[PDB]
Design a protein around this ligand. Sequence first.
Ligand code: HEM
Ligand code: HEM
Ligand code: HEM
Ligand code: HEM
Ligand SMILES: [As]
Ligand SMILES: [As]
Ligand SMILES: [As]
Ligand SMILES: [Zn+2]
Ligand SMILES: [Zn+2]
Ligand SMILES: [Zn+2]
Ligand SMILES: [Zn+2]
Length: 103
Amino acid sequence: XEDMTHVPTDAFGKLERPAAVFNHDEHNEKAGIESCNACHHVWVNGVLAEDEDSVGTPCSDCHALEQDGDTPGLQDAYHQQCWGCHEKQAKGPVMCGECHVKN
Ligand code: HEM
Ligand code: HEM
Ligand code: HEM
Ligand code: HEM
Ligand SMILES: [As]
Ligand SMILES: [As]
Ligand SMILES: [As]
Ligand SMILES: [Zn+2]
Ligand SMILES: [Zn+2]
Ligand SMILES: [Zn+2]
Ligand SMILES: [Zn+2]
């Protein structure tokens, strides 16, 4: 994903919002994220593997559009991951129009 400049949107069908800006490799370098499983996680039987990751599997392979149990639907997965870290670190966009950029 070194060519990535927005988050993939094909799983959603018709969009309400602009694609979310996300230059994956530059993002992750500026943010200081050193583990891939900060996002590409592996959750098994309610427990998060600390030493594994799911790189190479789309989020949308596990996260349906609808919530399943405590597995978030796909929109909420992205909002909880992305907007959740920004809020926890007090850095990064936290308005709709700073990710979903109209341009
Ligand atoms: C850690 C260094 C890391 C790697 C390696 C990695 C790889 C990776 C690949 C190969 C893809 C698929 C790209 C494609 O389809 O061409 C991908 C996709 C996404 N990633 Fe990633 N990624 C690493 C780390 C991070 C981190 C720390 C985050 C969150 C900040 C992140 C997130 C994403 C997202 C979102 C995508 C798109 C998912 C999809 O549905 O295809 N990755 N990454
Ligand atoms: C792709 C980068 C991706 C995103 C985004 C994502 C988000 C995410 C969130 C925010 C949660 C809630 C719990 C937490 O904050 O970790 C969550 C939950 C689970 N996920 Fe996920 N997830 C992404 C990727 C994937 C992939 C590729 C898988 C399947 C291999 C997967 C699985 C799950 C499961 C299962 C859960 C529920 C865990 C639990 O509470 O039992 N996720 N996802
Ligand atoms: C989830 C896929 C995700 C998105 C989308 C995302 C976007 C995003 C943007 C657009 C920025 C601003 C870039 C700019 O300067 O123009 C930004 C910045 C930060 N992010 Fe982020 N972000 C996503 C996920 C994550 C996660 C999971 C983390 C923490 C683990 C995270 C962290 C940060 C940090 C820190 C920054 C600020 C970088 C800086 O300017 O110092 N983001 N993100
Ligand atoms: C502000 C509260 C806000 C809204 C509103 C919003 C909407 C939203 C929707 C409706 C989707 C589903 C796809 C669609 O367009 O129909 C969606 C998807 C994603 N979002 Fe979002 N979102 C708002 C806030 C934010 C912020 C602050 C971020 C960046 C941290 C962000 C990110 C994302 C991501 C990633 C996705 C999935 C990929 C894509 O649709 O772009 N949202 N959002
Ligand atoms: As680089
Ligand atoms: As929140
Ligand atoms: As809070
Ligand atoms: Zn753009
Ligand atoms: Zn560099
Ligand atoms: Zn790995
Ligand atoms: Zn909050």
